[PDB]
């Protein structure tokens, strides 16, 4: 009963591969020969945010492009001001190991999660003057890897038990679940219209899930190792994945295959965080060789080098207006490159 | 209008800086440990003598130790074990012994010892079930290892009296099997501390205390470029 199903799955994979080869007209590097290159990108460290003790593991920018959260593994979640370098808030955490954080699009709630398998949602409406644990979401059997807000009521979370979930903040129950992966779902990226979302796992595959329907639409397998990060293009029709084999890959949603492969001979370090710019020309990749690289997304040429950190760069964020780039590494230092 | 908001933000920043200085004085005094092992190792008696993660707060000679025990997780360890990179010690507890457990323990210790980000953290080894080794040697350690018969007893260590020679021979054979892959690519930045424990023993906390003291002393000698 297993041999016939495995051979049918192999025949369907061969049909998908033949369709992807038949739909492959021409590559992007052949048609981007007449494109003017970007050139040297000089980004300097304008601000340096030093208030953490342990390693900064994640961050997220606000909607007003002014405040930003930063979670560390000492038991701190500090809400920084990027303009006047002042600490707006500092939340002490219940569990000291926190692997992800999020900021609301309205600017009211802040979520966090880690090895305690509990998504803690804090409220920034200080009626009493002090922040308190507004909600706790506990329905996963693995570690919480990433979490993002759709609105003030719903939250998409990804866990280490090969499942993603859609939680309602008011009730506290899973609206829908997503079970199609075989490895740890490392990260997710919401669409700008908040209709679909991608999720990359440890089986070198990124799947495109629907929020309203709750089932997978497309699957993308083009890597050789664990996909650590993923990010959408600013229009919402392509995305880029960073993996552990020192290669970045830009996939397309419509063509159902990869468009670009970013690699180099000297780079033998895996990628931790990827993020586009506001327009979509520069692609930021944070490697493990203590510096970040600014690739040209249309010509696959490394334009810039952001080398100011000492330890592994774990989190990288671009604001909505594209004004600055916040990078946080394991030396407890946030840096505002511009 | 902006002056009052700037003064309020400066006062809030001063309060948060005072709170973070106090939290730093609390944080740098406590020493954190990672308890890791297999399923049949016997960590339940270890946590009874001394959710996703399990918290254990204790103190010896007014020195706070916080032990972190991994609970409701999966077998995929290659993503969250990078989170334990600033701990002072990984207490790796295995039992000497169905499938082969010692080879899986050796492969796990080889993967921890040769990790890219775990080159600075020291591993405190614990061999838990010694009474089971004494009971199973009478009527299976020679089947999984063909070099057990062609092995000499080390004379540089003092064994406990009133024991069979085969029991202590298997003890130091397992010890040398861990020290073969331990003393291969260590290069002085991180060390391993093998130990022998039993079920009912309250002398383990002093062993962890002395081993963490040795780790911090070797770290301070490394920072001065003396050792």
């Amino acid at each position, epitope marked *: 009963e297993l041999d016939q199903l*495995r051979q049918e799955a192999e025949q369907l*994979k061969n049909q998908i*591969r033949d369709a992807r080869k038949a739909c492959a007209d021409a590559t992007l590097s052949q048609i981007t020969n007449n494109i003017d290159p970007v050139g040297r990108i000089q980004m300097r460290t304008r601000r340096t945010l030093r208030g953490h003790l342990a390693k900064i593991y994640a961050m997220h920018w606000g909607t007003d492009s002014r405040l930003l959260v930063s979670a560390s593994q000492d038991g701190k979640l500090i809400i920084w001001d990027s303009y006047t370098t002042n600490k707006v808030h500092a939340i002490p955490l219940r569990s000291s190991w926190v692997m992800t954080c999020a900021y609301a699009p309205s600017g009211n709630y802040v979520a966090c999660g880690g090895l305690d398998n509990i998504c803690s949602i804090y409220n920034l409406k200080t009626r009493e003057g002090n922040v308190r644990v507004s909600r706790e979401l506990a329905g996963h059997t693995g570690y919480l890897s990433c979490c993002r807000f759709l609105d003030d009521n719903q939250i998409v979370t990804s866990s280490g038990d*090969t499942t993603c979930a859609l939680w309602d903040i008011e009730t506290g129950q899973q609206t829908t679940t997503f079970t199609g992966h*075989t*490895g740890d779902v490392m990260s997710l990226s919401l669409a700008p219209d908040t209709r679909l979302f991608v999720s990359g796992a*440890c*089986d*070198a595959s990124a799947k495109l899930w629907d929020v309203r329907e709750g089932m997978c639409r497309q699957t993308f*397998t*083009g890597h*050789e*190792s*664990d996909i650590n990060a993923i990010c959408f293009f600013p229009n919402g029709n392509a995305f880029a994945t960073g993996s*552990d*084999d*020192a290669t970045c890959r830009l996939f397309d949603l419509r063509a159902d295959q990869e468009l670009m492969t970013y690699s180099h001979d000297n780079i*033998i370090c*895996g990628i931790t965080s990827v993020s586009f710019s506001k327009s979509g020309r520069l692609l930021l990749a944070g490697y493990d060789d203590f510096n970040c690289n600014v690739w040209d997304a249309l010509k696959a040429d490394r334009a810039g080098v952001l080398a100011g950190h000492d330890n592994r760069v774990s989190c990288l964020g671009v604001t909505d207006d594209g004004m600055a780039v916040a990078t946080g590494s394991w030396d407890s230092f946030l840096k505002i490159w511009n | 209008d902006q002056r009052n908001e700037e003064k309020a933000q400066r006062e809030a920043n001063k309060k948060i800086e005072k709170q973070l200085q106090k939290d730093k004085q609390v944080y740098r005094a406590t020493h954190r440990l990672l308890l890791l092992g297999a399923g049949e190792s016997g960590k339940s008696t270890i946590v009874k003598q001394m959710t996703g993660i399990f918290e254990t707060k204790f103190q010896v000679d007014k020195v706070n130790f916080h032990m972190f025990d991994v609970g409701a997780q*999966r*077998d*995929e*360890r*290659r993503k969250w*074990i990078q989170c334990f990179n600033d701990v002072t010690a990984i207490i790796f507890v295995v039992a000497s012994s*169905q*499938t*082969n457990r010692l*080879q*899986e323990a050796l*492969n*796990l210790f*080889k*993967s*921890i010892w*040769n*990790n*890219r980000w775990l080159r600075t953290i020291s591993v405190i080894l614990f061999l838990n079930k010694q009474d089971l080794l004494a009971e199973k040697v009478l009527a299976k350690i020679e*089947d*999984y*290892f*063909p*070099e057990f018969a062609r092995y000499t007893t080390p004379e540089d260590a003092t064994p406990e009296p009133g024991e069979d020679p085969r029991v202590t021979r298997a003890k130091y054979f397992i010890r040398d099997e861990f020290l073969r892959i331990s003393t291969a690519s260590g290069d002085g930045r991180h060390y391993c501390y093998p130990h022998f424990t039993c079920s009912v023993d309250t002398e383990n906390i002093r062993r962890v205390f002395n081993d963490c003291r040795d780790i911090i002393q070797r770290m301070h000698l490394r920072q001065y470029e003396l050792l």
Partner: nanobody
Amino acid sequence: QVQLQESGGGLVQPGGSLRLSCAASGFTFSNYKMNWVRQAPGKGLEWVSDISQSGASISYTGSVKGRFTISRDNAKNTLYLQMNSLKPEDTAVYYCARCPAPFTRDCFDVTSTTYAYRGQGTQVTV
């Protein structure tokens, strides 16, 4: 797409020899240290052997020492395992597995329940 295909097996006589082949496709073969891991019926998975990237560091389990030969061909893009002088205990499902990270020595999740970087395996009954 990462795909690993096993070949060889079948019911043979005890004490004979056999040769397993593992064909890899979808990645660079010369960057990853590879493993052979078996799973007995009614028991869990157990690690058999491994070969490194260049082929210098070759290690075995003690129960299979001196009776197994693991080799690799980077140009031919394949992994061979020669097994002479078998025993009736070796009847298992064998897998050729790939370590998840390149240019490294550590291999964490090779002997696990749900690992995606290994093939469907082959049945060897002695």
